[PDB]
Design a protein around this ligand. Structure first.
Ligand code: WGZ
Ligand code: CL
Ligand code: CL
Ligand code: CL
Length: 258
């Protein structure tokens, strides 16, 4: 694996420590992206846990998880490139901001696609990747892929909008993930998270109460019902992955297609 095997098309995003760039694989013209990380200032310990993290990326292979392709070490410029799938539709955060700014709600069909495909991504993770809009990506074929938010971080002030009731009291619980999914799907429909506040303490008060507005009336009672169940205060009242996928709303066409 050599950087020379690829040509950079342009930069998609830039963080404090590295960049994400759209690239083209020379051999066959495949369009991909890479994360460019300067590890020059890292300690041996930091570099070791970087290797271990990257190894985990190689472990997951699933149609609804952003696919890892390659890793390239350029020891000359002390840069590491992590090559992954290009998702032409971008991230969900951008989609929500767009709807919010342009005052246009998303189709129920699109929300069902996200629910179906992220629930399957979650199911694979649980077999053995934060559930947040900025970490969910869309390809050019109506597919939805869960990213590695560890990549965004490697490139406190934030309000933890999606924190579950049990998590703010200790997590380590698969049903906590269902709560976060509920928040995400809620925000996709409402163009705002179900619980808002200016501080974490205020937010926590609202979460504990467990009340929120119905998603907009353009969305079916069936869709509102399942999202509302995911936002139950009791983890054991939230539906499992299996129970979500059994919902009559979810059909073959909402799943991934090559
Ligand atoms: C840090 C980065 O993490 C990413 C990026 C991934 N990815 C794969 N194909 C993509 C196409 C677009 C895209 O972001 C866009 C471009 C600019 N818009 C204004 C917003 C949408 C990202 C794409 S996968 C992946 C991961 N960690 O698995 C990232 C994450 C969220 C949003 C942007 C970015 C980036 F801009 F840095 F790329
Ligand atoms: Cl609106
Ligand atoms: Cl609709
Ligand atoms: Cl697919």
């Amino acid at each position: 694996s050599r950087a020379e095997d690829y040509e950079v098309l342009y930069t998609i995003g830039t963080g404090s420590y590295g960049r994400c760039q759209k690239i083209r694989r020379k051999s066959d013209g495949k369009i991909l992206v890479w994360k460019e990380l300067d590890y020059g200032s890292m300690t041996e310990a930091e570099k070791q846990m970087l290797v271990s993290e990257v190894n985990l990326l190689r472990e997951l292979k699933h149609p609804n998880i952003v696919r890892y392709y390659d890793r390239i070490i350029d020891r000359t410029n002390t840069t590491l490139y992590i090559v992954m799938e290009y998702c032409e539709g971008g991230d969900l955060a951008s989609v929500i901001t767009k709807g919010t700014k342009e005052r246009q709600y998303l189709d129920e069909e699109f929300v069902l696609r996200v629910m179906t495909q992220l629930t399957l991504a979650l199911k694979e993770c649980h077999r053995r990747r934060d559930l947040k809009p900025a970490n969910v990506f869309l390809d050019g074929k109506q597919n939805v892929k869960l990213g590695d938010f560890g990549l965004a971080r490697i490139l406190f002030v934030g309000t933890p909008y999606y924190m579950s009731p049990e998590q703010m009291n200790r997590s380590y619980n698969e049903k906590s993930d269902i709560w976060s999914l509920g928040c995400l799907l809620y925000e996709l429909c409402a163009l705002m998270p179900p619980f808002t506040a200016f501080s974490q303490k205020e937010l926590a008060g609202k979460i504990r109460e467990g009340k929120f507005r119905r998603i907009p009336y353009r969305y079916s009672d069936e869709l509102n019902e399942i999202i509302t169940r995911m936002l139950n205060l009791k983890d054991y009242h939230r539906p499992s992955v299996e129970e979500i996928l059994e919902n009559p709303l979810i059909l073959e066409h909402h799943h991934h297609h090559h």
